[PDB]
Design a protein around this ligand. Sequence first.
Ligand SMILES: CCCCCCCCCCCCO[C@@H]1O[C@H](CO)[C@@H](O[C@H]2O[C@H](CO)[C@@H](O)[C@H](O)[C@H]2O)[C@H](O)[C@H]1O
Ligand SMILES: CCCCCCCCCCCCO[C@@H]1O[C@H](CO)[C@@H](O[C@H]2O[C@H](CO)[C@@H](O)[C@H](O)[C@H]2O)[C@H](O)[C@H]1O
Ligand SMILES: CCCCCCCCCCCCO[C@@H]1O[C@H](CO)[C@@H](O[C@H]2O[C@H](CO)[C@@H](O)[C@H](O)[C@H]2O)[C@H](O)[C@H]1O
Ligand SMILES: CCCCCCCCCCCCO[C@@H]1O[C@H](CO)[C@@H](O[C@H]2O[C@H](CO)[C@@H](O)[C@H](O)[C@H]2O)[C@H](O)[C@H]1O
Lengths: 55, 85, 167, 60, 378, 85, 186, 77, 102, 189, 87
Amino acid sequence: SRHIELKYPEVFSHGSPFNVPAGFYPNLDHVIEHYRKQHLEEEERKAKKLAAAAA
Amino acid sequence: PVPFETLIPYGIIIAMFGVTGAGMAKVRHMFNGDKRHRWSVDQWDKQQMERDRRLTGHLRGQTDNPIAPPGFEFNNPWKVXXXXX
Amino acid sequence: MATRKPAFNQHVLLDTTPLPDSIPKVKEIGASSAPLLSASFFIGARCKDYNDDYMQCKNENPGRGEFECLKEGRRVTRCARSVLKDINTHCLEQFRAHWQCLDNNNQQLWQCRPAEWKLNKCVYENLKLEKVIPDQPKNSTPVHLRQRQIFAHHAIPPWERPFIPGQ
Amino acid sequence: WARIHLIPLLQAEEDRDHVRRYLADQAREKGLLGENIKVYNSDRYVRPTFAVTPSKPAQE
Amino acid sequence: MSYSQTINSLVEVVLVLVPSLVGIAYVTVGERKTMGSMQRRLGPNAVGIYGLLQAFADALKLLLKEYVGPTQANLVLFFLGPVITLIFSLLGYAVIPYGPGLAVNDLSTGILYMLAVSSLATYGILLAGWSANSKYAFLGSLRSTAQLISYELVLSSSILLVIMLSGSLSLTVIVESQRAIWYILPLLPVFIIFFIGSVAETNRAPFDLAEAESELVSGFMTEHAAVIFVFFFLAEYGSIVLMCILTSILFLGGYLLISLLDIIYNNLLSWIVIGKYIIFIFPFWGPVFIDLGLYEIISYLYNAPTVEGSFYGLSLGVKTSILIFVFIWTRASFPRIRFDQLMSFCWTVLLPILFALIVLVPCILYSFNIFPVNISLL
Amino acid sequence: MSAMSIYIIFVSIIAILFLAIDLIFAPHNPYKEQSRSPFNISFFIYGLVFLLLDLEILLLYPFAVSEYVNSAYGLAAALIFIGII
Amino acid sequence: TPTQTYQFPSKTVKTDYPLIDNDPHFTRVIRYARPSDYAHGLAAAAAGPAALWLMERISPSQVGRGGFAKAMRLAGFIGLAGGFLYFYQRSILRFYGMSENAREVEMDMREMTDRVKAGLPLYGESRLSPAMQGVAARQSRYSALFFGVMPWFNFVNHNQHGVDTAKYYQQAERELEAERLAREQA
Amino acid sequence: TTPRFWSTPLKYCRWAARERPALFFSVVIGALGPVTLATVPPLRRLIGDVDAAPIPLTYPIPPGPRKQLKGYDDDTE
Amino acid sequence: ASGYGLNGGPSRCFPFWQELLACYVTNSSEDNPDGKNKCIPVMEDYYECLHHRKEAARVRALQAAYREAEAKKLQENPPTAGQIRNLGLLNKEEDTKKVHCA
Amino acid sequence: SQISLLLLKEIYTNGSTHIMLDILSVLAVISGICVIISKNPIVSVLHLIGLFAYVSFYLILIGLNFVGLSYLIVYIGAVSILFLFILMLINIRTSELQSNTSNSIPLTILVGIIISSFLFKMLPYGVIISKNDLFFITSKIWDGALAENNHISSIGNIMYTNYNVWLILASFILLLAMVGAIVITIKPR
Amino acid sequence: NITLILFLIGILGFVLNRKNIILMLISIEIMLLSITFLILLSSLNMDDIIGQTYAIYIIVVAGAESAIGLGILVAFYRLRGSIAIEY
Ligand SMILES: CCCCCCCCCCCCO[C@@H]1O[C@H](CO)[C@@H](O[C@H]2O[C@H](CO)[C@@H](O)[C@H](O)[C@H]2O)[C@H](O)[C@H]1O
Ligand SMILES: CCCCCCCCCCCCO[C@@H]1O[C@H](CO)[C@@H](O[C@H]2O[C@H](CO)[C@@H](O)[C@H](O)[C@H]2O)[C@H](O)[C@H]1O
Ligand SMILES: CCCCCCCCCCCCO[C@@H]1O[C@H](CO)[C@@H](O[C@H]2O[C@H](CO)[C@@H](O)[C@H](O)[C@H]2O)[C@H](O)[C@H]1O
Ligand SMILES: CCCCCCCCCCCCO[C@@H]1O[C@H](CO)[C@@H](O[C@H]2O[C@H](CO)[C@@H](O)[C@H](O)[C@H]2O)[C@H](O)[C@H]1O
């Protein structure tokens, strides 16, 4: 593997909630859609695995 | 009976504490433009006084005019330092 | 320039270069620090939409919001100039009474309640604007309306009444 | 809440000044060196950390 | 600003140091006069009209005395040592507020400043005792250092409990927060522990037996070194006065006078524009206060910057003096405690109670929604 | 200049002057004219128990000036830290 | 529908069974525990005290009069400690998807849907700030996996649980549309 | 003479209150903190003492799309 | 990188770090080896924010141009500090006109 | 027409001289030299108390009061005191600790060059930031100055919540230094 | 640059020491004061509070090594009667 997968993807939710200047934090919905797709694909694989092998 | 002689030194100490607070409140009053001095000042209060200097020239100066005078746009002070950062 | 607090600053650098003619000019707010605090709750009664739009435009465009949000900032400084203009037109005496109080009170609001209540009376009558502090507790009197202020250095005389809009 | 109703007016004045001094420095560079040097590979405005200053202050 | 900063810097520093120094001199006269009334005698009453010059002659005598301490193998230590012990004594006064913000340095970490200057006290008791040459006495300087470090934990751990209530380390904010109530009332047992810890910290009697035993084992060949030096005496008296002002800042009002102008407002209800000032009370009548002569003058003097500052400092002074009495009264009331017994008091009684209260206090402040805001308010 | 600077220098001047009266005015005579015992271990224990508890209370001072934000979650962690020490 | 069911980036772990929650609340963990979970916790808990008594009989300590009673107390606390951690860790791995959890997926689907139709916040109401809720959630997500070294439990009502909550809302919608037709029919 | 906690729990507690008071009441006070957390807060919500809302420590940006304001434009200047 | 600054607010170079984390996580995978090559300029900006070497280099030539460009041109009347300190003040219009050469 | 950039002094809201940092560096170096050359270990610990003070002031001078005061409370307050206790009770013959220092001058010369030449390249640009000289520039902000916190409140906002695992390990390190140091010194009972 | 020099001082305390096991105790703490001091000055440069906190935990571990170090040195002295190294 030359690719690193973050063990803590929750560092995208890090950052002080106080004295925040407008525009300081970046628009990271492209990131949240990545992780949403990853959770939905993994839910599907197991779904497709323990439902097609339970019959 | 009351031994007021032993009580004389204590009254001296109370008079000294009185003179420090008396004399320090007045020197600050005059220093601050014959107005009461500011106390628990944060970054916001200090910058607010800096913009007071911009409008009037005095850090304690106050003006209620709705329009800023000409030149106000360029008098915004950007501080310069040699070392720390 | 950087937002870092300075420790060894000894000089100021001024740039006399003017803003370009492409950007529409706006007359700037000229009220000092204490006049602004006296009129602070009036401004957010009227310009809250403009004040919130300006902060939203900047949030919408990260890292590029000083530019690209310039029209909105001019809208906020015109809304606030109209409040400062309106207060001088009708409540000048009560306004100056309150902000000159705050000058000698560490600009602490609880230290000038008798002056504030009179200004709130005059601004509500003349400009129909009202001081509102959002999300205040529900089981007690609002702090800005209490007959007694615990942290006041001088006691509020009992005949000085808090201004309730309608009594 | 009293500092909130003032934060947008005070910021707006600072933002016009940040645009003024940034546009002025870009122009001051184009004449002096003939072009602009790009310090970041993004359109983000970074608040300057260094400034070009005169070699001397006012006489005072 | 109206005039130059250096002038303003100089006037405030002189206005704090010269009254503080004159006061530290009268605590020495006062402790001999108070102990004499309680011992049915007189204090000094001859050097000066009422003995008011006793401190002056004592100090000038020592200054003129020969000093025969070892200058060999240590020249700086003999001379430049105790000098900065006196600096570490006066450096704590630069954060005392004589009214809101009326301090030399208004410091947000003002409390952590006075915790730093206090840990330097241990050096002025360790190093001076290093000069005396007698085996048992040297171990008595280590035992005095051990008492100071132990009773410093008492003070710092109990200062912590005040900070939880105030939310700030600024002495001004800590006093302003007591406008609601003095901290002696809700933190009663913390105050007593602090005052007892503050006597033990100053090495004062009844906690002075370690440094007391040096004079009993000196022998027939060697002697002490604190001899002609007024430094370690001004360092001592000034640390007692400073432990009284800080004790008042934290638990008594600080500079807070209980204002009677609130009471008169509640009682008086017959406001009259003719200047009569009738009162709606049972002992009341129609007063004849002169509007032209008195009321106009009295109202102006009350709002004067000099008068209001004066009362703020007379309040802090009256409260410090009451505590100076309680230190002198304590020395005249008790015998001495042995070093092991004071150590047991600190480590097996006081500190266990303090750590029990360190748990309980923030737990109650959470239970009654009373955690203060830690932003700059007040 | 700042006030804290002028204050230390002032005290420094006074502390020097009392040396000057002593070294100027007090008389000065030129003539300025080995065993082992175990030390008690309790001296070591006094310094050590102080050193650790003093570091421990130091770690709690940030909590007392950050209570409102810390709230229940911060309290629980600090209670755990208080409990261990 | 809140228009955003996946609101926070979360770690996907490769496991053999469906995830119900990254960070189940303590009461949900207790409430879903199957009766076998109780047998196993009690069985492990008694083991440390019984191991210690077994050792004393087979290889006596030769200790004084009260020493074994003191040790029995300590071995007993460790048994209640390890016993409860094992019982909790056995229930919470079905939430994580690291144990067969067909039963608890149904119990989860019912309750979470029954909450939606009641208008309730899906994961309850937190007295803590949205930011302190996010700190709490990052601390407790998959933390029963570190129990052998450090104990941690969720006692906060955050809404960050690693799951796309569209399904609970979808099933509530399909269940509401089923009941409405029945009422209209009769 | 002095009792044993695990033989006579109540009898030890009286001796410790009488013979080791600073130590005994330290453990008592330390336990009151854990109790006060458990007890007062539910009783407070019974009597209706609602906890105050948190104070703002950042600019309070409202959620949703921008409102499309009209007013205070360059022409008005 | 932490997100927490000295004044209680966020850290100055935290936006650049998230812009760099977002780039790497959404452009580089095991399917595509070079996707992380879009993170190169994004990583440079992060290293620039923390250290300020390229800005220091830029402002060190521009300052050398201006200082010898304003060292040889004719000076008419340099405004004194007291004049600058009265700029924009409501009763010193004469000084402001001198400063802005209008 | 006139120079657009204008540089003038600050009359009241000024700041500190950067000269003091160069002084406090010199004494810290001077104090540190005397630590590792002093014959008597008592004196070396005193030169250490001096070095800790100069570094403490250096930090206070650049804005880091809580940690600069923490260094004062912790090192000079308590660590050097424990060092003084032990060093004033252990019997020390000051000539048995004295080694021929003149031999190690060449190895001092060699290791000084090699370490200095390598490690200095590793430091970042901001630390070695200190003839056209670059000036650092600062300006005000309003949204970020609403409720500013002192450094200790900012450390506290995160020390007990987000990074609380660091508090757990430290609690256990201090707890081990209690049990372990008591158990290796005292005679039980 | 001061941080690196003060690091050298701690190193050079190990270069010049044939007899002082106390100066070996001392120089370890000079080295710790360099590394903590470097972390702190870079934290001011990047506006990060984590550098400040990391300094705090270095200071707390540094004091704990002094307790363990002076405790072990006491245990050694009790049976030795000398901290000296015969050479
Ligand atoms: C002005 C700055 C300081 C310069 C030096 C000033 C003098 C300092 C020493 C005098 C101050 C008071 O110091 C204190 O004096 C009293 C006498 O009154 C002494 O007291 C001594 O005599 C009294 C006489 O009744 C006895 O009760 C007591 O048992 C005995 O110890 C104390 O032992 C001494 O500590
Ligand atoms: C917890 C916050 C604390 C805030 C206040 C901190 C104040 C610290 C001031 C320290 C000044 C020096 O501290 C003080 O020094 C003197 C001289 O060494 C000591 O005094 C010592 O010498 C005198 C004689 O000259 C003896 O009578 C005394 O018994 C002896 O202990 C005091 O015991 C000590 O308290
Ligand atoms: C730090 C600020 C600068 C320094 C300020 C203080 C200066 C001090 C030096 C000047 C005063 C010297 O003080 C004086 O010294 C001399 C010499 O030691 C002493 O002189 C004594 O010893 C000498 C030895 O040669 C004898 O010959 C002489 O007859 C005898 O009186 C005096 O008794 C003392 O009073
Ligand atoms: C000389 C080499 C030394 C190596 C030291 C380390 C050896 C580690 C051996 C243990 C490996 C894991 O062993 C594992 O334990 C868990 C305990 O619940 C069980 O694993 C089981 O877990 C849960 C139930 O709890 C089931 O949902 C899962 O399907 C099943 O695998 C099995 O017993 C075994 O698969």
